[PDB]
């Protein structure tokens, strides 16, 4: 496949990693009696470990000669779950914070003491604003084609140079 | 305060219990609208059933009898397996198509208030009190819209309904009267 | 008669794409002016009216047309029909491409900047009124056939988008699964 | 107690409560849906 | 003297020989140059493909190389023609 | 020019508040003063100073 990689369910070296990770925890398990808390903890760890290899095998990830999963970010839609889909997710949450935080500064600006409300949050007002950023791509778009997103060039102070 | 009832005899009965105590005048309209819808539907159904029973299908009346056009669904085979067991032989594609037209009509009866669709509203025009009067305005080459026409239409509606219900029942199981 | 009969008699610009380039001072001439957007819409429409009719006239069987110039290559689908024709007929393909290249270059060579409202021509006005039409017709008809050309351009652009989507997403437009 | 409420609205107290709620948000999701390298789950 | 304002540059930028010339001649010349460049490239490619003509760099020919050099000339001439047309020439 | 209470924009380039807005407080009527206009601001500069004197050709009026 891409870059001469093989899928992880068919990699001979990915399977060896699964065995040696389980063998290491089994040889630690043998020094304890079967009902005790260290034996139940290591038994639960080998279940977590065994479920970690099974998950990847059917995942659809690509392995190398090293036996480790690789990620593809060319833009292929077949490997979307690797970068695109968690990427769109992060953009939604990061742009949500920046939008909401900016709404707050603009709101408390027209006031006697704007600086007072940055060290001591008006929580009822802040709480209201935080959840209005769920539709930010629409709200950031309405202000771009209004004139309320970016200011004019005669409103920004500039260094003597330019 | 509704429209004309039975011509031979009249009886409103179950009408003041909802258009005065339970509901109001808005419910009256709605009820009439529903009645008219059902009536028309029943009429069309009746005609279809009649045609099917008679024999005037594509094979008898035109040069084309191949409905499926890929699923090998001829009209002869559908006309030899009754009316109730024929609707189930209709290809999914066709079913989808039919659902489309009806959906469109219903939507129109819902959005396009009077002459044109309404762009801004809390709810659809027909979803409000007295949203659907019953008349869609579809009057191509309209001959008349008098006080007699409406009554006649209504009568034909209920009659049609009863007729088709009876027909279905008889195809399915022993009815009562002759056909 | 107005061009807006299907959107309520008002200019359909949701997403305000004509107002951009004027909303802010921040990209100086990086979005197209009204004159450039008007020629792009006419040009995309005229290429779509020809291309839809092309894929419709060469489709064999089905509803189809199956009409075929004698001597040209028989190809079933429109998706590969260019590259077959490009390899087999170099002289005819090169003369069509040169004709398109000159006429499309002449469109802008005599007039000013289009991207900025500095063109001095009406958008869509290529010197192809050979029939002498609009010199014989009156102003109500001439303004009317412009709107006729526009909406038929617009119906064909949506058609070409359907024709693209059915081959990239196999269940996209369902009215063509059946229609073939 | 309107002065304790203004004390609970000061920026470092709100920052630790917000972070405590948000670290524990991520810890809880990693407790039920662990080892999610990607969407494959 | 070289600096210019407005939509199009003055005729003097083209040079002493070019400014005197009419737009039509320049456009025709540019088209001819383009034709020569493409034909030469195609011929060179054919020679490269051909057996017994490509050994020890035999495919390279002086005339084809001249046409290849001529592609840039075709671009410049067309630009000059546009400028000439703009200056009402 | 401005009056008392007018909102102006600073046009001095080496000022901290170039292209920035603020409020006229006092205009010295005596024209021997080169910079007759006290203009106050709500944000401080790097030396934590809140006001400055200006000439009439260095301030613009907003509305
Ligand atoms: C460390 C990583 C990290 C992560 C993962 C997050 C994650 C999040 N932050 Mg945080 N944050 C962080 C660090 C982080 N933050 C840091 C370092 C700071 C600086 C101090 C902040 C500052 C901060 C602020 C101020 C805010 C956030 C908010 C948010 C949330 C925005 C998205 C959301 O509310 O849910 C997604 C919600 C939806 C997708 C709902 C969709 C919209 C509804 C209408 C659809 C309804 C669908 C329906 C219910 C489905 C049911 C149907 C049924 C049939 C199934 C999100 C949980 C915001 C928040 O908490 O929201 C109130 C917020 O205001 N963050
Ligand atoms: C399905 C049937 C159907 C019908 C008949 C119509 C008809 C109409 N549409 Mg709608 N439309 C439909 C479905 C339909 N639409 C669907 C499915 C959509 C997408 C969801 C739309 C989206 C839509 C938009 C966005 C717009 C319209 C517009 C219009 C009207 C043209 C504008 C105007 O000024 O006329 C007004 C008509 C008159 C002044 C004459 C009145 C005479 C009456 C009887 C109407 C004619 C009879 C009736 C239409 C027939 C329907 C009966 C049915 C059994 C066939 C026209 C009445 C435009 C509009 O109305 O607003 C400006 C408009 O902007 N349509
Ligand atoms: C779904 C169709 C439908 C609807 C909505 C109506 C609605 C209405 N009819 Mg009506 N009608 C129908 C079918 C329908 N009818 C049929 C088939 C006949 C022929 C027998 C009649 C004959 C009839 C007469 C003779 C008159 C009306 C009248 C009226 C109006 C006042 C009566 C009332 O309050 O509702 C009636 C009650 C209901 C709609 C309740 C619904 C029934 C329940 C939920 C289920 C019943 C199932 C039933 C077992 C089906 C078998 C049929 C039955 C005969 C055994 C009202 C608008 C009167 C009118 O216009 O105002 C004076 C009037 O004069 N109708
Ligand atoms: C002018 C529009 C138009 C066109 C070109 C077609 C074309 C087609 N219809 Mg049709 N159809 C139309 C309008 C149209 N229909 C309308 C308005 C209705 C009523 C809602 C139907 C109801 C209909 C049915 C019920 C069926 C078709 C079927 C078919 C297709 C045969 C498929 C092989 C054929 C391509 C048949 C089909 O899809 O078979 C697979 C089929 O069974 N159509
Ligand atoms: C006995 C049946 C009957 C009667 C009296 C009416 C009467 C009326 N309908 Mg109507 N309708 C009917 C059946 C009927 N309809 C059916 C079955 C349907 C469903 C398809 C409809 C659907 C319908 C709509 C969608 C609308 C009306 C409307 C109207 C009113 C005025 C406009 C109009 O079309 O006049 C109809 C004129 C006549 C019925 C007289 C002519 C005689 C008929 C056509 C003979 C029919 C024979 C046969 C079915 C036709 C096939 C030809 C065959 C002989 C070869 C009017 C009161 C409009 C309305 O409510 O506005 C107020 C409206 O919007 N109707
Ligand atoms: C738009 C003009 C145009 C273009 C681009 C071409 C291009 C081509 N023709 Mg063609 N041709 C044209 C017009 C054109 N022709 C006309 C008007 C005729 C007469 C009717 C012919 C007759 C003709 C014949 C008879 C044959 C070709 C062949 C070829 C191919 C050359 C061989 C090869 O592999 O390419 C070599 C690579 C290149 C040409 C690319 C070089 C591009 C460089 C970067 C310079 C740019 C070109 C130039 C300066 C710009 C043109 C300006 C123009 C818009 C005014 C090539 C694809 C031959 C072939 O192999 O068939 C497939 C062949 O047999 N053509
Ligand atoms: C950057 C190169 C370049 C430049 C500056 C020009 C400039 C001009 N061309 Mg020309 N042209 C070019 C490339 C170029 N051309 C190419 C590649 C072809 C195809 C072979 C043509 C074919 C052509 C025709 C047929 C005609 C012109 C005409 C003209 C003149 C005005 C009308 C016009 O621009 O529309 C033409 C617009 C285009 C060709 C758009 C394509 C531009 C190129 C391909 C984009 C690449 C630029 C990119 C940003 C550079 C990045 C820098 C670096 C990374 C390489 C003008 C002097 C006309 C003329 O003579 O004046 C009356 C005319 O009729 N051109
Ligand atoms: C290279 C360019 C050479 C041009 C010569 C000089 C041109 C000139 O001086 O003025 C240029 C003239 C045009 O004159 C234009 O007038 C303008 C008016 O503002 C300008 O002022 C310029 O004078 C000029 O641009 O060119 C022509 O009119 C004729 C073009 C020459 C044709 C060359 C193409 C040949 C096509 C093949 C024909 C084959 C037909 C035979 C088939 C039959 C059987 C086989
Ligand atoms: C479906 C199908 O099968 O159909 C076929 C046939 C069809 C449609 C024909 C096909 C085609 C080929 C096409 C479309 C070819 C297009 C060719 C094209 C577009 C050629 C423009 C030349 C412009 C010139 C010379 C301009 C001169 C301009 C002149 C001379 C002026 O001075 C104009 C002047 O204006 C001023 C400035 C001011 C006015 O006061 C005065 C006048 C008016 C004098 C297809 C694609 O093959 C399909
Ligand atoms: C009488 C009259 O009126 O005539 C009319 C006729 C007509 C047609 C109507 C008119 C017109 C329009 C015209 C003439 C339009 C012309 C357009 C034209 C001719 C556009 C060329 C572009 C060339 C380029 C981009 C070259 C690139 C060349 C490149 C990128 C290279 O690097 C070449 C090169 O790399 C090779 C390949 C390899 C090496 O071996 C050599 C080197 C490394 C250098 C006019 C103007 O109205 C006049």
């Amino acid at each position: 496949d891409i870059s001469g990689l093989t899928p992880c369910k068919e990699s001979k070296q990915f399977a060896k990693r699964e065995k040696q990770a389980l063998k290491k925890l089994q040889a630690s398990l043998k020094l304890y009696a079967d009902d005790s808390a260290p034996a139940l903890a290591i038994k639960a760890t080998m279940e977590k470990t065994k479920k970690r290899f099974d998950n990847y095998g059917k995942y659809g990830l690509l392995c190398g000669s090293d036996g480790l999963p690789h990620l593809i970010v060319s833009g292929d839609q077949r490997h979307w779950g690797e970068f695109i889909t968690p990427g769109i997710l992060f953009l939604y949450i990061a742009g949500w914070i920046g939008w909401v935080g900016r709404s707050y500064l603009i709101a408390i600006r027209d006031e006697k003491k704007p600086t007072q409300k940055e060290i001591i949050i008006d929580v009822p007002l802040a709480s209201r604003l935080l959840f209005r950023g769920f539709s930010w791509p629409v709200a950031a778009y309405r202000e771009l084609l209004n004139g309320e997103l970016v200011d004019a060039a005669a409103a920004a102070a500039a260094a003597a140079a330019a | 305060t509704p429209l004309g009832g039975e011509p031979v005899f009249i009886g409103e009965n179950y009408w003041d219990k909802l258009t005065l105590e339970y509901g109001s005048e808005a419910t009256g309209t709605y009820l009439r609208a529903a009645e008219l819808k059902h009536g028309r539907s029943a009429m069309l159904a009746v005609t279809g059933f009649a045609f099917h029973k008679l024999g005037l299908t594509l094979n008898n009346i035109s040069p084309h009898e191949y409905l499926s056009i890929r699923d090998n669904i001829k009209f002869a085979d559908l006309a030899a397996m009754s009316p109730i067991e024929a609707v189930k032989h209709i290809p999914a594609e066709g079913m989808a198509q039919i659902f489309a037209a009806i959906a469109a009509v219903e939507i129109y009866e819902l959005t396009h208030r009077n002459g044109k669709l309404a762009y801004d509203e809390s709810v659809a025009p027909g979803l409000q009190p007295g949203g659907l009067t019953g008349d869609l305005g579809w009057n191509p080459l309209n001959i008349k819209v008098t006080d007699r026409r409406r009554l006649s239409e209504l009568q034909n509606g209920r009659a049609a309904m009863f007729a088709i219900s009876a027909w279905v029942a008889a195809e399915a199981i022993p009815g009562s009267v002759p056909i | 008669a107005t061009g807006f009969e299907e959107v309520g008699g008002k200019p359909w610009d949701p997403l305000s794409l004509g107002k951009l380039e004027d909303a802010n001072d921040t990209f100086p001439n990086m979005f197209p002016k009204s004159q450039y957007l008007q020629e792009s819409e006419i040009k995309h429409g005229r290429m779509s009216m020809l291309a839809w009719t092309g894929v419709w006239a060469t489709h064999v069987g089905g509803m189809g047309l199956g009409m075929h110039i004698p001597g040209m290559p028989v190809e079933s689908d429109w998706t590969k029909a260019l590259g077959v024709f490009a390899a087999e007929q170099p002289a005819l393909f090169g003369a069509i491409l040169l004709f398109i290249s000159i006429a499309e270059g002449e469109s802008v060579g005599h007039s000013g900047d289009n991207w900025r409202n500095m063109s001095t021509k009406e958008p869509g006005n290529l010197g192809f009124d050979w029939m002498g039409l609009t010199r014989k017709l009156s102003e109500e008809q001439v303004a009317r056939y412009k709107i006729v050309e526009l909406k038929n351009g617009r119906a064909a652009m949506i058609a070409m988008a359907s024709l693209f989507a059915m081959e990239a997403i196999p269940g996209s437009v369902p009215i063509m699964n059946v229609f073939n | 107690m309107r002065d304790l409420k203004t004390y609970l609205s000061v920026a470092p107290v709100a920052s630790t409560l917000w972070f405590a709620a948000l670290a524990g948000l991520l810890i809880e999701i990693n407790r039920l849906f662990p080892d999610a390298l990607t969407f494959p789950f | 003297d070289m600096t210019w304002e407005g939509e199009y540059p003055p005729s003097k930028v083209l040079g002493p020989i070019m400014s005197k010339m009419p737009s039509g001649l320049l456009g025709l010349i540019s088209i001819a140059c383009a034709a020569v460049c493409v034909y030469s490239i195609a011929q060179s490619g054919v020679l490269q493909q051909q057996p017994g003509a490509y050994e020890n760099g035999s495919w390279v020919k002086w005339y084809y190389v001249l046409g290849s050099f001529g592609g840039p000339l075709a671009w410049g001439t067309h630009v000059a023609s546009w400028i000439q047309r703009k200056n009402g020439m | 020019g401005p009056k008392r209470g007018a909102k102006v924009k600073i046009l001095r380039k080496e000022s901290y508040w170039y292209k920035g807005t603020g409020s006229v407080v006092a205009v010295d009527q005596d024209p021997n003063t080169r910079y007759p206009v006290v203009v106050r601001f709500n944000k401080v500069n790097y030396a934590n100073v809140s006001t400055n004197n200006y000439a009439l050709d260095e301030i613009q009026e907003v509305e």
Side-chain angles (χ1 to χ4, degrees), chain A residues 1-11 13-33 35-58 60-79 81-88 90-131 133-162, chain B, chain C, chain D, chain E, chain F:
Chain A
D1 222 350
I2 342 188
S3 295
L5 295 175
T6 186
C8 293
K9 65 182 181 181
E10 293 179 353
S11 179
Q13 183 67 40
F14 182 76
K16 182 173 72 66
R17 276 196 194 274
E18 181 177 3
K19 294 181 177 67
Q20 296 294 321
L22 294 174
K23 246 258 100 158
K24 185 176 179 181
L25 294 173
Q26 291 178 359
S28 179
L29 182 64
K30 67 184 288 183
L31 295 174
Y32 301 106
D35 62 357
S36 65
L40 294 174
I42 297 170
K43 182 175 73 175
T45 301
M46 293 182 288
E47 293 179 354
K48 286 189 295 262
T49 300
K50 180 68 174 65
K51 297 297 287 183
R52 182 160 58 263
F53 285 91
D54 294 347
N55 181 351
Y56 294 174
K58 41 174 223 261
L61 285 154
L62 294 175
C63 283
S65 66
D66 51 24
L68 295 174
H70 283 192
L71 299 174
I72 302 298
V73 295
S74 64
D76 274 340
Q77 296 286 351
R78 26 194 216 106
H79 294 281
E82 300 183 347
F83 182 75
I84 299 150
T85 300
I88 272 142
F90 165 91
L91 290 185
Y92 182 74
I93 298 170
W96 177 323
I97 295 151
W99 187 254
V100 145
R102 185 190 116 111
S103 228
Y104 183 78
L105 305 162
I106 275 191
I108 64 171
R109 179 176 297 170
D110 291 331
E111 188 184 351
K112 294 182 183 293
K113 295 183 290 293
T115 62
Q116 183 67 40
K117 289 181 171 168
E118 294 178 355
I119 59 164
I120 296 171
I121 301 299
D122 189 357
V123 176
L125 198 223
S127 253
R128 140 140 61 130
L129 295 174
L130 295 174
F131 61 43
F134 84 90
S135 77
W136 70 264
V138 177
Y141 199 84
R142 318 244 258 213
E143 294 182 355
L144 180 62
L145 293 175
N146 189 0
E148 294 294 328
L149 184 63
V150 345
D151 45 278
Chain B
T1 25
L3 231 220
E6 218 249 318
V8 149
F9 251 116
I10 331 199
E12 33 146 69
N13 64 34
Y14 269 160
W15 161 264
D16 204 288
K17 183 178 179 180
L18 24 167
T19 333
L20 207 134
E21 295 302 320
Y22 281 156
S24 49
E25 40 142 357
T27 18
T29 26
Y30 185 95
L31 279 187
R32 188 99 274 165
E35 185 154 85
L36 275 187
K37 233 236 226 354
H38 279 259
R40 288 141 183 195
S41 100
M43 303 213 257
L44 286 199
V46 159
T47 69
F49 209 96
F51 270 50
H52 192 340
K53 257 7 194 348
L54 296 225
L56 350 151
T57 33
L58 272 227
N59 2 247
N60 319 320
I61 205 198
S62 85
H64 4 240
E65 83 310 357
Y66 243 108
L67 170 80
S68 191
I69 224 13
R70 235 123 76 138
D71 310 32
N72 228 64
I73 324 240
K74 352 196 86 180
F75 300 128
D77 319 12
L78 284 211
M81 59 174 28
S82 79
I84 276 196
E85 331 246 51
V87 222
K88 350 203 111 277
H89 277 343
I90 294 188
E93 277 182 57
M95 271 306 222
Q97 265 158 98
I98 291 164
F99 177 72
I102 296 161
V105 169
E106 292 296 68
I107 290 296
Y108 166 86
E109 187 195 339
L110 273 182
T111 29
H112 310 226
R113 129 213 311 317
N114 212 209
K116 13 51 173 13
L117 172 73
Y119 283 118
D120 319 280
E121 243 108 7
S122 27
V123 269
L127 265 205
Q128 283 144 55
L132 337 139
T133 145
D135 101 70
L136 302 224
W138 182 52
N139 195 353
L141 25 92
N142 52 190
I143 323 74
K144 219 65 273 181
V145 172
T146 61
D147 249 40
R148 148 106 184 176
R149 278 261 143 51
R150 314 185 106 112
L151 205 229
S152 73
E153 179 183 61
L154 248 192
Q155 231 60 57
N156 284 259
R158 318 153 106 121
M161 266 171 154
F162 157 81
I164 198 290
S165 99
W167 289 0
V168 155
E171 207 89 342
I173 28 256
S176 268
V177 280
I179 77 89
Chain C
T2 62
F4 294 101
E5 293 84 3
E6 294 84 2
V7 175
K10 291 182 181 179
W12 183 65
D13 192 1
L15 294 177
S16 295
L17 294 175
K19 293 181 180 179
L20 181 63
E21 182 64 26
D22 291 331
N24 291 315
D25 62 356
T26 186
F27 284 91
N29 289 316
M30 294 299 291
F31 293 101
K33 281 306 227 271
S34 45
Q35 292 178 358
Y36 182 80
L37 294 173
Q38 290 176 1
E39 186 179 358
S40 296
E41 184 180 2
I42 296 169
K43 186 182 288 179
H44 277 80
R46 290 176 181 178
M47 293 180 182
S48 296
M49 292 184 285
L50 293 176
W52 183 80
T53 302
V55 300
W56 174 43
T58 61
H59 181 74
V60 64
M63 292 180 184
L65 260 279
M67 66 181 73
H68 181 74
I69 298 170
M72 302 282 110
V74 176
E75 182 66 27
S76 66
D77 62 357
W78 61 272
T79 300
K80 293 184 264 73
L82 190 281
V84 175
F85 181 75
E88 293 180 354
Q89 295 297 110
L92 184 60
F93 181 76
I96 296 167
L97 183 63
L98 182 63
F99 181 77
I100 295 168
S101 296
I102 295 167
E104 182 67 25
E106 281 264 301
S107 303
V108 68
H110 300 266
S111 297
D113 190 358
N114 202 169
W115 182 262
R116 304 179 289 147
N117 290 319
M118 293 177 71
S119 66
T120 303
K121 68 184 290 184
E122 184 178 0
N125 188 0
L126 302 238
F128 216 36
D129 185 41
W130 60 282
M131 234 122 40
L133 303 177
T134 74
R135 295 215 154 227
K136 14 195 81 169
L137 294 175
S138 67
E139 293 83 3
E140 181 66 27
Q141 270 133 320
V142 175
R144 195 225 161 220
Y145 292 103
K146 291 181 181 179
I147 297 170
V148 176
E149 204 202 9
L150 232 218
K151 292 183 182 177
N152 290 318
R154 289 177 183 176
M157 291 186 283
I158 297 168
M160 294 299 293
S162 297
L163 273 299
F164 292 165
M166 67 174 282
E167 292 179 354
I169 296 95
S172 66
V173 64
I175 195 63
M176 296 297 293
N177 249 359
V178 154
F179 257 6
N180 200 164
Chain D
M1 40 137 163
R2 293 178 65 88
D3 291 330
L4 182 64
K5 291 180 185 295
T6 303
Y7 167 71
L8 294 174
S9 297
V10 71
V13 175
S15 199
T16 61
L17 295 174
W18 192 241
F19 296 96
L22 180 62
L25 197 154
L26 311 174
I27 295 167
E28 300 303 35
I29 296 169
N30 271 278
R31 178 172 87 168
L32 304 178
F33 313 87
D35 295 332
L37 192 19
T38 28
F39 242 25
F41 69 169
Chain E
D1 30 327
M2 266 345 164
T3 76
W4 56 285
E5 201 189 349
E7 300 317 344
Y8 62 87
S11 255
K12 58 161 147 178
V13 304
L14 295 178
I17 281 101
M18 304 259 242
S19 37
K20 317 296 209 288
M21 312 187 162
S23 19
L25 214 221
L26 288 171
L28 290 198
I29 287 175
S30 84
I31 268 137
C33 286
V36 169
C37 164
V38 175
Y39 172 88
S40 147
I41 278 172
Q43 273 338 301
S44 115
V46 166
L47 279 182
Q48 272 172 18
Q49 236 126 36
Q50 206 169 107
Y54 83 84
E55 6 249 272
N56 313 305
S58 39
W59 64 271
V60 174
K61 291 314 164 106
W62 59 280
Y63 30 103
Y64 295 140
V65 181
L66 266 180
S68 79
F69 273 156
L73 273 188
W75 174 91
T77 27
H78 107 285
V79 169
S81 146
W82 184 91
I83 293 168
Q84 281 311 51
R85 196 209 261 145
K86 274 322 214 238
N87 291 279
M89 278 189 74
Chain F
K3 293 187 286 185
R4 180 176 295 171
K7 298 291 180 69
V8 297
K9 256 217 180 53
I10 301 301
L11 295 174
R12 195 182 270 182
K13 292 181 181 179
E14 69 274 18
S15 178
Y16 181 78
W17 293 271
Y18 182 73
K19 292 186 288 184
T21 187
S23 179
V24 176
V25 175
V27 176
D28 189 359
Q29 296 295 321
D30 185 74
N32 290 318
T33 300
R34 289 145 208 256
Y35 304 100
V37 178
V38 177
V39 182
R40 294 183 181 277
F41 306 94
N42 62 6
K43 65 185 286 181
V44 299
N45 63 6
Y46 292 156
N48 291 318
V49 176
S50 180
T51 187
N52 190 0
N53 266 260
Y54 293 97
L56 288 214
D57 70 347
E58 279 166 348
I59 27 195
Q60 232 223 278
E61 267 253 15
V62 298
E63 70 273 15

